[PDB]
């Protein structure tokens, strides 16, 4: 019932919180990766 | 008879009380379950 | 005899009254049950 | 009987209410997930 | 006897009335469920 | 005796009449039930 | 009995009617889904 | 006695008739169901 | 029973008909896709 | 008794007949499905 | 007495005759039932 | 009495005979079912 | 039943509506992605 | 079923339409790219 | 029972027979696929 | 009673015998299945 | 009854405790997995 | 008579006492069961 | 009566003991299963 | 009377003896069943 | 079963037929591509 | 449902925002790269 | 009961034994697979 | 299937048509380029 | 779908716009380069 | 059970055998490919 | 329950241990790969 | 596709136009250069 | 399985055959190219 | 849950640490490469 | 496959044909160039 | 999400910083190279 | 599990062995290539 | 694996063989070229 | 992880070692080349 389902929203909320966060930190890695590639290209070139 | 049947309503009432409650706490488990799945998916992905 | 049998109808009437009532309150429980199952399914799923 | 079955509609109604709601909040998670994937792809790429 | 059995048809009729109705409202829940699944799939995918 | 027993056949006849009839209307309920289950399955599935 | 069972065929018929219909509309969703995937692939690619 | 029991066979016969028939029409529903699932799978896939 | 199962073959047949057809039209899309890739490669190259 | 149980074997036999048959036609669908997937893969690839 | 009791055996014999027969025809129904269930399962499955 | 009860053993024996037999033929159906499922899985897969 | 199944069509309709829409907005992202790749290629080149 | 599957062809058709179109406009970009390379080569050279 | 279960082994045996066979023919397709890819690579390259 | 219950153990024993056996032959199928999947993967890959 | 149902809450509580915990340790594995993938990508690249 | 019927209430009271108690301890088992299922699901999943 | 019902609690207690234990050992299997899956994923990946 | 009722306890005792025993051997079957399922799952999986 | 599985081989055969064919026509494109590159090189050079 | 899907558009919007932005900053790098190449060529030359 | 449940532990133990073993041999395959991929990459590259 | 695969050949054909054509027009550019180089050399020289 | 694909054309258009522009400004550099070479040659010479 | 699981090892063994073999022959192709590239480079060069 | 779930942590721990280890040895391969590429580049160049 | 490839010819045409033109103006420079050399020689000489 | 995998070797063999052949004919082109360059150099020179 | 997700950040952190480091050491190689090229050019020249 | 690869030889053949031809006509230009230089030298000289 | 994408800009910024810098120091080398060539020419000449 | 994972290290080890070896022999080719270029330059020059 | 990798060495060996050979014959051309230049110089001179 | 990444540094180190070395020996060749050119010039001259 209802009340029990307010608790649903609560745990789901924590859930989404976690997600965008984690997904964010992954991106931190990717940027470092990306950019390290661009330098690698600058040497290749000149 | 009648009076005896008011007591019926009484015990049945307790009955339903118990039910929606228990059924509720089960759902608490399910949400935790569900959401723990979503995080598991965020790692899989990124 | 007859008169005595009008009293029959009377006690039987109370009888049926009681029945549909009690049977009704049982159903209240079942609906709560049913629907609590449907929520349990929504978590399972998503 | 009838009256008892109006109460059925009532509890079932709450039921469906709960469902589309919960199912909705799950989707909130999925969108965040999805889109976090698209960014992950933008880095991969460039 | 006969007359008493016309009343049978009557209560049984109410009975069936109730049934297809309730069974109907359950389906309302299921559709909402179903379709909420399809959206969940659209995110998964794209 | 005999004549008295023709009346037996008569009341028994009414009896059987009633039975197959009532038993019939019960089945009307069951079919509605059954089939409402099949729809419930179509949603579950797709 | 027999007659009562013609009514069976009747309610079952409605039943099947409903089914292929609903199952059909679900497919409408799936096609839209499918094809939206193919476009998503055309971008990925070129 | 005997004769009375030939009538038994008769009503039982009708009985079985009804059964395989009804059971048959149910299957009509199931096939429609089944196959509608297979199409649903063809979209999922391609 | 048997007869009822000839109808099974019938609905299943329609089923398979549908499948190879749909699966076919999907392929029409894929070829267009594929080949559009090959042109994209001819430009890349020269 | 015995004789009555030879008829059991008979109806059960028809039963199994039906089964392996139907189950067979389902497989016809699956093969068409499968293989249509393999072509879909040949385009994806080249 | 004795002779009168040979007639007992006679009517009892008819009795048992009737029984195993009727009980037999009931089983005919059950087999049809059973097996119709197995087909219902083959669709469910595949 | 005793002798009458040897006949009991006799009819019960036939009884058990019938049972393991019938139960056996049912299993024949199940195996066909089972295995038809495994093939269905081989297509699904490859 | 029927009426209850008109409501099915209704919720399914909303369903499909949602889908093609969402699937659409995803594509908006992909195009931006794609094209940003093409510019990245123009620099690489010249 | 059949009719429902004509709608499949319809949505798939739109699908393919979209594809060859989009894939086409991508090529417009590539040609401009290509040719801009050839001019870049004419300067390099002379 | 036992004998009935020797027949189990028999139908299961056919079952496995079918499986490794079908699974085999699928592989025939895959090899053709694979190798057609390798040629596609030889052109790409030289 | 006791003796009658030694026969219970006996039939139950046969029972379990049958079970682990049949369950075993099913596994034979599964292994063939599994491994045929792994080869399918080796082609996919290289 | 009530008291007996307080014990329900108790065992269910332990239940949920266990769940989020276990689900947590699984995630520990996934992160290690994920990140080990990212390093694998850094080598691939440079 | 009356007094004798006060003793009725007494033994019936003990009766009900016993019942709700026993019924309670059964539930203790069920909860342990239930929850052990939920853990089993957490492993299945992750 | 009462005393007899203390013995009820006793046998029920053993009962629950058994349950949580067995249910526990099942979980031992599941964990081994789960984790063996995670390794299988590490190979798939790298 | 009393003495006669000591013999009651005696036959009832044998009774319970038999029960827990038989019920035990049934469980032997179930475990074999259960566990054979878990292996079936290990193949499915890997 | 067997016969049903000869049809498997049949549809799979068509399948492979299609594959090597299509894969072939793709190669026709690649050769034209390749060689058009070699001419492009002859101009570059001289 | 609908409302829940307005939130979809919202998160997707942010998504696309992010993308064209990031993709933009990457291009900033590429231009700097490109042009640094052109200077490198001016020295090579004169 | 208890003793019967020691046998449970026994069969479950064998069960788990089997599992980690089988799951192990599967991994043997995967490693061979994996590593054969790495060599395939060394050729691709140089 | 087959017919669907004749359409494959058709779209692939158009594909190759396009390719050799485009690749051709590129060469037109290259020749003009080449030869313009040769004149540039005649001036350099004399 | 369609509308969503008009937006595709739109973003692709911007895309191509950007390209021919950028590619153009690069050429501005090349001409300056080229011609600065020709002067360098006039000094070398005379 | 155990014995049945020795057969598991057996079929898995064949499995791995097949794999390293096939994977091996693929490499034969790759080497031929690789080296044919190196010759192609020797011409390019001198 | 709890204790049973400490064993969960234990097997999961071993699990993660295995993972980071294996994932590690894979990386050993990749580094050797990577670096062997860099040497290949030094020859290409000078 | 075709139409899209007529546009290819169009942009390529502009391309070649540009080329022979630019290449032409370069030659204008070269002639002026050349001839200025010849005068330089006439002075050297006489 | 094994036999099925002999066919693997067979198709792979054809595969490699094709490769070294095609790769060979490409080289024929390259030599003609190369050497045509050397003549071009003899004119340049003398 | 939350706490479990702090550990996520932790392992991801190590992850990124590793990455920028490794990516760094690769660059050390590239610089040595680059510069060794410049010396190679100084000899070529003078 | 094979046949498809005879067509490879065919298109490659045309390819080489084209090459030696074009390369030839280039040489025609070079000779005219060369020799025009020799006359230029005869004037310089005498 | 957003915040996470501000960090993107940050790491990309560092990235570009690095690039123009490194690219700059390369040019320092080139100038030294260039000019050392011009002196080499002054000796050649006079 | 553990032991099974020692075998992982073993097959991975062989793996890396193979790699550095093969990668090595490739380099043998490259050196021969390189140096053959240097001789080609000595002729060009003197 | 190992054995498969001895074949690698074999094909690579042939590879290198081919290379130094071809590279050798190219040099034969260059010497003839070179020396023909020296004679051309002897005439120029005297 | 970390430790595994210390080994990365190790193999990369060897890598760079190799590079500057090889690149060095190439330069030895170039100097010999260069200087042999200068002598060639001294003869040309005087």
Curated annotation (Swiss-Prot), chains A, B, C, D, E, F, G, H, I, J, K, L, M, N, O, P, Q, R, S, T, U, V, W, X, Y, Z, AA, AB, AC, AD, AE, AF, AG, AH, AI:
Main location: virion
Topological domain ranges for the Periplasmic compartment: 1-21
Location within or outside the cell: Virion; Host membrane
Membrane topology, from the record: Single-pass type I membrane protein
Transmembrane domains' residue ranges: 22-42
Cytoplasmic side, ranges: 43-46
Family from the record: Belongs to the inovirus capsid protein family.
Subunit structure of this chain's protein: Homomultimerizes. There are several thousands of this protein in the phage capsid.
Name of the protein in its database record: Capsid protein G8P
Lineage: Viruses, Monodnaviria, Loebvirae, Hofneiviricota, Faserviricetes
From-to range in the entire protein, with total length: 37 to 82 of 82
């Amino acid at each position: 019932g209802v009340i029990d389902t307010s608790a649903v929203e609560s745990a789901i909320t924590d859930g989404q919180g976690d997600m965008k966060a984690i997904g964010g930190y992954i991106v931190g890695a990717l940027v470092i990766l990306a950019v390290a590639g661009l330098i690698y290209s600058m040497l290749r070139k000149a």
